[PDB]
Each structure stands twice: as C-alpha cells, then as structure tokens.
Design an enzyme around this catalytic site. Structure first.
Site, mmCIF file in Angstrom:
data_model
loop_
_atom_site.group_PDB
_atom_site.id
_atom_site.type_symbol
_atom_site.label_atom_id
_atom_site.label_comp_id
_atom_site.label_asym_id
_atom_site.label_seq_id
_atom_site.Cartn_x
_atom_site.Cartn_y
_atom_site.Cartn_z
ATOM 1 N N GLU A 22 0.835 -1.199 0.000
ATOM 2 C CA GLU A 22 0.000 0.000 0.000
ATOM 3 C C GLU A 22 0.874 1.253 0.000
ATOM 4 O O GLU A 22 1.967 1.263 0.568
ATOM 5 C CB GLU A 22 -0.923 0.017 1.220
ATOM 6 C CG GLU A 22 -1.681 -1.273 1.440
ATOM 7 C CD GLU A 22 -2.803 -1.471 0.443
ATOM 8 O OE1 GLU A 22 -3.043 -2.628 0.039
ATOM 9 O OE2 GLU A 22 -3.452 -0.473 0.069
ATOM 10 N N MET A 27 -3.075 1.243 -3.691
ATOM 11 C CA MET A 27 -2.172 0.100 -3.694
ATOM 12 C C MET A 27 -1.033 0.252 -4.693
ATOM 13 O O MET A 27 -1.108 1.045 -5.632
ATOM 14 C CB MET A 27 -2.947 -1.195 -3.964
ATOM 15 C CG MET A 27 -4.098 -1.036 -4.933
ATOM 16 S SD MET A 27 -5.183 -2.479 -4.941
ATOM 17 C CE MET A 27 -4.054 -3.746 -5.502
ATOM 18 N N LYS A 43 1.805 2.651 -9.148
ATOM 19 C CA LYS A 43 1.089 3.138 -7.979
ATOM 20 C C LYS A 43 -0.289 3.640 -8.401
ATOM 21 O O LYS A 43 -0.405 4.443 -9.329
ATOM 22 C CB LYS A 43 1.856 4.276 -7.299
ATOM 23 C CG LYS A 43 3.295 3.969 -6.950
ATOM 24 C CD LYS A 43 3.886 5.052 -6.043
ATOM 25 C CE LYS A 43 3.669 6.447 -6.621
ATOM 26 N NZ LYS A 43 4.207 7.529 -5.751
ATOM 27 N N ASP A 138 11.421 15.513 2.911
ATOM 28 C CA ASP A 138 10.961 14.326 3.634
ATOM 29 C C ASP A 138 11.875 13.126 3.431
ATOM 30 O O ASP A 138 11.412 11.983 3.290
ATOM 31 C CB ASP A 138 9.507 13.991 3.251
ATOM 32 C CG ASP A 138 8.827 13.068 4.261
ATOM 33 O OD1 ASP A 138 9.173 13.108 5.457
ATOM 34 O OD2 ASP A 138 7.944 12.297 3.854
#
Ligand SMILES: Nc1nc2cc(Cl)ccc2o1
Length: 337
Positions: A22, A27, A43, A138
């Site tokens: 996921e 998913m 994706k 990130d």
C-alpha cells in the site's frame, strides 16, 4: 484488471499483476510492461477527494517529470481516464525497485563499505535536487528505494518545495526534522535529514525518535548537548528563548561513544550534518567532498540540473484536479504542443 477486490485497470499494456503493498492513496503493484518487456511498479493514486492529496500528487508529478537523474525515481508512464469527470484514479508507472532502506535496516546490519556507497548515492541525488533549487523535505529510509547496494533511488517528492530562505510564512517526518523547523525553506533541512539517515544506518535505529515535537528537540539536545548562546540567539520566535532556556543542562555525547564501531570519518561527516545551527551545517557539495566519500567523489560524474526549478498553493481540489489533468495529458493519445 482485478487485484484483491479492487480495480487496477492498467491493461492492455501492463499485465501479469502482483500485489506488493500500500502507498499514500492506493495500492502498489508490479506488472509486466509488454512494450518494454520488463516488470515495473505501478502506484494507484486516488487523491481527488482531498485538497492536500491533490497538492502532493500534482507536486510529485511536476517535479519527477522534469528531473532526470540516476539516483532519483522517474515516471515512465501515467494512466488516467480520457475525460476529467471519469478521472477517479491516476496510475503512475515507475521502475520496479525491490525494496527500500527502511525494510533493509529491519533485517540487516550494514557494513561500513555499504553505508559509505549508500550515503554517496543519497548525496549524489541530493546534489542534483539542490542544484534545481528544490528541497525534498521528507528524506528518510522508506523514501530511499533499493535494488542492490549499487542501485539507490530517492522517491516521494510529494512534499518538495522550491527553496526560499525568506519564508516565513503540512509536516515532514518528525524523527528526521531539523531543529530550525521546530524552532522557527532552506537546503540545510535536507542535510539534517540525511544526517539522521546516516546515524540510522550506523546502528539500525532512529537516532532521534521523539514522540512529539518537544520530545524531538529533547532527543536532539540529549545528544548534541545544550545549545550555545550564539546558536540560541538565532531563534526567530521567543520559545525557544525562553522555554529551554528552561531545562536541565546537557553535555555533548561524543559520537564515538554513541557509535563505538563506526568509521571515524563517517562520524566526522555525521557531526557536520547534524549541527544545530543550520548556517554552520555542511552543504551538499561539501558533504560529497568529505574524506569519508573520497573514493567516490567525482564532480565530472555528478550531474546537476540544467535550469533552476520554478513551478503557489491555496487552490481548491477542483482546480488542482484540472492541473493534474493538464500535467498528465502528455501521456494521452493525441497530445500536442
Ligand atoms: N518504484 C517502486 N518500486 C516499488 C516497490 C514496492 Cl514493494 C513499493 C513501491 C515501489 O515503487
């Protein structure tokens, strides 16, 4: 067309689907690409209900289509409905990567050699990213995809921003968050994240695993020691100064005490990446030129961006939807201009 009671619908080009996990908004599968004759990752993204989901999706698509670099995941293809109204999902096709650094660190202690070349690959990618004036924001082990020790790709640019030191003015992952972010858009925030990643490779555990942002600062000061007055003055807020100025005084834990088995050059670079004051924190080119990475450093084989990147955002999810529709038209039949 069906994987685990949900539609995939990437055919006829992509077949022989296999569920792998996921993601953010749907998913992920591996599929056989009948054109390129190789398995790929796809994706499924369904961001349209929520404005923020639409922001990250648009951002990642725009950036990844413009970046081209061996240490950065690309976008190979994008599936979407012919008409906007029908567009409920977006399928993003990328190179299949076997695993990521987060999964890897759960199962293996990395050798010094492997840490060194992983670090080089991260900074090589980062160098390209920063040369385009972009901040990833990130960076963390699960955002570093891997096939082998020699094949690492940075992913997830959903939170990336053009660098903007004068701003001022949704969060990036707490454990990897630079102290200046919590205390008051600079390249230095990515360097801090990479330093946290290096520390994590050295010991198979997050160096600063705070529960919440004050606990995060506590973990940081717990190791770097209480901040100096000079570093204290450069806090645009009041809280901090005061508020801690308000806690117990802490001494710097020596890196070699924290990491007794680590290469001393790795620890010296780790020290430069994890410095409190962002103005004194090592920059990407400097980090690549550090003795720890000297066996790999090669500016002639370290591409940078052609042109600095320029896309702001408080747009409703309906306007973002059209913008995602525009950025993805590229991959549709009949596209022109
Ligand atoms: N490119 C890419 N390969 C992937 C493999 C998994 Cl298991 C999950 C996400 C992925 O993204």
């Amino acid at each position: 067309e069906m994987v685990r009671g949900q539609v995939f619908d990437v055919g006829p080009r992509y077949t022989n689907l296999s569920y792998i996990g996921e993601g953010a908004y749907g998913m992920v599968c591996s599929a056989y690409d009948n054109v390129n004759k190789v398995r790929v990752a796809i994706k499924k993204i369904s961001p349209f209900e929520h404005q923020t989901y639409c922001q990250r999706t648009l951002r990642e698509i725009k950036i990844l289509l413009r970046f081209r670099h061996e240490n950065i995941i690309g976008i190979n293809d994008i599936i979407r409905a012919p008409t906007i109204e029908q567009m409920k999902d977006v399928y993003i096709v990328q190179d299949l990567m076997e695993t990521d650094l987060y999964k890897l660190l759960k199962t293996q202690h990395l050798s010094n050699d492997h840490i060194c070349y992983f670090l080089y690959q991260i900074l090589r990618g980062l160098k390209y990213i920063h040369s385009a004036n972009v901040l990833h924001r990130d960076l963390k082990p699960s955002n570093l995809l891997l096939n082998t020790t020699c094949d690492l790709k940075i992913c997830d640019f959903g939170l990336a921003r053009v660098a903007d030191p004068d701003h001022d003015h949704y969060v990036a992952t707490r454990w990897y968050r630079a102290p200046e972010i919590m205390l008051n858009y600079t390249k230095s925030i990515d360097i801090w994240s990479v330093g946290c990643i290096l520390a994590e490779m050295l010991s198979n555990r997050p160096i600063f695993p705070g529960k919440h942002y004050l606990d995060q600062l506590n973990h940081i000061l717990g190791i770097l020691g209480s901040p100096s007055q000079e570093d204290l003055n450069c806090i645009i807020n009041l809280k901090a100064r005061n508020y801690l100025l308000s806690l117990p005084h802490k001494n710097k834990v020596p890196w070699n005490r924290l990491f007794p088995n680590a290469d001393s050059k790795a620890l010296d670079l780790l020290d430069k990446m994890l410095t409190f004051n962002p103005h004194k924190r090592i920059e990407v080119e400097q980090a690549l030129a550090h003795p720890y990475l000297e066996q790999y450093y090669d500016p002639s084989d370290e591409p940078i961006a052609e042109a600095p990147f320029k896309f702001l955002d408080d747009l409703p999810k309906e306007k973002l939807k059209e913008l995602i529709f525009e950025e993805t038209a590229r991959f549709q039949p009949g596209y022109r201009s």
